[PDB]
């Protein structure tokens, strides 16, 4: 059989998610506690959320001038980027208060993740950035490619076992990227999740976005912008032939 490196997803559990939350960042902390960053001018926020209920336990509303983007948690601090700017915000997770700001050298601010030592960033280009959390200088730039094509639109990120997984904006795909060298290690296809919500009558929903990993219990959670549900998912390696050019069409929008 092929080393397909393409996965489909099974829903293990469904949980409520705020259908007014324009998800741009998603983090799993501990004890069924999530952190989330939302966008939209006048609606951007960082939130502590209970997994089981989707209840917002604590919220920090941003100034109306910002469009909140990616979010990650590193050593008790939540780091957040914002659309079109090089500024980012740091919140203490104990209080959800803004303790510090920073500036990074990306070309935009879309996604953040961490391996527990440094920050990874995306900005909608095909570059996955390594960012030093002390100096906020770039450590390295990985140019992510698939079959020679640039993988642009890298969006919400999550570090999982040596990989950085990235939503690709406006697709139902997640790229699995090597944190070591930027290699495209695999593609996850999730179109069944949005389709299921549309079929349940939730017609006003926006795109798949937001990935969070619970390392302790080995749970993967995903949601989407304005989605009324957040899903716990299990990956399954494909056991069928992927048509020529399928990933290029559906995940790279070529
Ligand atoms: C998570 O739950 C454990 C065990 O129930 C508890 O001791 C710990 O304080 C919790 N972690 C938090 C709230 O950060
Ligand atoms: C971060 O910068 C924003 C925008 O200028 C400002 O409102 C806030 O006070 C800053 N936070 C800190 C901790 O300096
Ligand atoms: Ca994430």
From TrEMBL:
The record's EC number reads 2.3.2.5
Task: Name the Pfam families on file.
Answer: Glu_cyclase_2 (PF05096)
Residue spans making up a coiled coil are none
**Amino acids binding Ca(2+):** 26, 156-158, 211
- Keywords for this entry? Acyltransferase, Calcium, Metal-binding, Signal, Transferase, Zinc
The residues that hold Zn(2+) are 26, 156-158, 211
User: Per its record, what are the GO molecular function terms?
Assistant: glutaminyl-peptide cyclotransferase activity; metal ion binding
Q: Which residues bear sugar attachments?
A: 31, 101
Q: Which cysteines are joined by disulfide bonds?
A: 173-251
Q: What is this protein called?
A: Glutamine cyclotransferase
Supply the source organism for this entry: Carica papaya (Papaya)
């Amino acid at each position: 059989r092929p080393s397909s490196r393409v996965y489909i997803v099974e829903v293990l559990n469904e949980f409520p998610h705020d259908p007014y939350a324009f998800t741009q960042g998603l983090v799993y902390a501990e004890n069924d506690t999530l952190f989330e960053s939302t966008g939209l001018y006048g609606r951007s926020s960082v939130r502590q959320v209970a997994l089981q209920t989707g209840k917002v336990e604590n919220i920090h509303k941003m100034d109306d001038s910002y469009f909140g983007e990616g979010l990650t948690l590193l050593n008790e601090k939540l780091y957040q980027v914002v659309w079109l700017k090089n500024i980012g915000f740091i919140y203490d997770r104990r209080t959800l208060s803004n303790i510090k700001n920073f500036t990074h050298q990306m070309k935009d601010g879309w996604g953040l993740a961490t391996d527990g030592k440094i920050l990874y960033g995306s900005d909608g280009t095909s570059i996955l950035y390594e960012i030093d959390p002390h100096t906020f200088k770039l450590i390295k730039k990985h140019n992510v490619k698939y079959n020679g094509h640039r993988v642009i639109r890298l969006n919400e990120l999550e570090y999982i076992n040596g990989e950085v997984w990235a939503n690709i904006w406006q697709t139902d795909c997640i790229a699995r990227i090597s944190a070591k060298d930027g290699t495209l290690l695999g593609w996850i296809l999730l179109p069944n999740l949005r389709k299921k919500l549309i079929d349940e009558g939730f017609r006003d929903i926006d795109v798949l976005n937001g990935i969070a990993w619970d390392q302790e219990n080995k749970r993967i959670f995903v949601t989407g912008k304005l989605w009324p549900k957040l899903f716990e998912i299990k990956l399954h390696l494909v056991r069928h032939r992927i048509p020529d050019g399928y990933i290029e069409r559906h995940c790279l929008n070529l």
